[PDB]
Amino acid sequence: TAYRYRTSVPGDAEAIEALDGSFTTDTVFRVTATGDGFTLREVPVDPPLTKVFPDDPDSRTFVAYGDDGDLAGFVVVSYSGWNRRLTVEDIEVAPEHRGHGVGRALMGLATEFARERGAGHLWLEVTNVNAPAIHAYRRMGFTLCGLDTALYDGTASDGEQALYMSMPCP
Amino acid sequence: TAYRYRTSVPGDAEAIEALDGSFTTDTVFRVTATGDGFTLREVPVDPPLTKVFPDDPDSRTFVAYGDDGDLAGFVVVSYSGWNRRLTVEDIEVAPEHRGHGVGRALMGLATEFARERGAGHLWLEVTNVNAPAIHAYRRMGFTLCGLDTALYDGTASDGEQALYMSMPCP
Beta strand A23-33 with A71-80 is: unpaired
In sequence order, what are the beta bridge partners of A91?
Answer: A75
Cβ-in-10-Å burial (0-12, 13-18, 19+) of A27 comes to middle
**Category of B154 on φ-ψ map: left (φ > 0), alpha (ψ -120 to 50) or beta:** left
Q: How far is B91 from chain A (nearest CA, A)?
A: 19
Resolution in units of Å: 2.2
B127 interface with A at CB cutoff 8 Å: no
Which chain A residues have a beta carbon less than 8 Å from that of B161? 146
Q: CB-based contacts of A163: which residues, under 8 Å, 6+ apart? A: A29, A31, A40, A125, A126, A127, A128, A134, A144, A146, A147
- How far is residue B136's CA from residue A39's CA, in Å, rounded to a whole number? 25
- How far is residue A147's CA from residue A37's CA, in Å, rounded to a whole number? 11
Count Cβ neighbours within 10 Å for each residue of B66-105 and write b for 16 or more, e otherwise.
beeeebbbbbbbbbeeebbbbbbebbbbbeebbebebbeb
**Technique used by the depositors:** X-ray
> Cβ of A144 and B85 within 8 Å?
no
> Cβ of B147 and A147 within 8 Å?
yes
Which chain A residue has its CA at the smallest distance from B150's CA? A145
> Cβ of B146 and A145 within 8 Å?
no
> Cβ of A82 and B155 within 8 Å?
yes
- How far is residue A143's CA from residue B60's CA, in Å, rounded to a whole number? 36
CATH class of B1-170: alpha beta
- The ranges assigned to domains in chain A are 1-170
Nearest of A160, A128, A158, A120 to residue A144 by alpha carbon: A128
Count Cβ neighbours within 10 Å for each residue of A10-22 and write b for 16 or more, e otherwise.
eebeebbeebebe
Which chain B residue has its CA at the smallest distance from A32's CA? B37
Give Cα B98 distance to the centre of its chain.
13
Q: CB-based contacts of A36: which residues, under 8 Å, 6+ apart? A: B39, B40, B41
Residues A146, A42: contact at Cβ < 8 Å?
no
Count Cβ neighbours within 10 Å for each residue of B125-152 and write b for 16 or more, e otherwise.
bbbbbbbebbebbeebebebbbbbbbbb
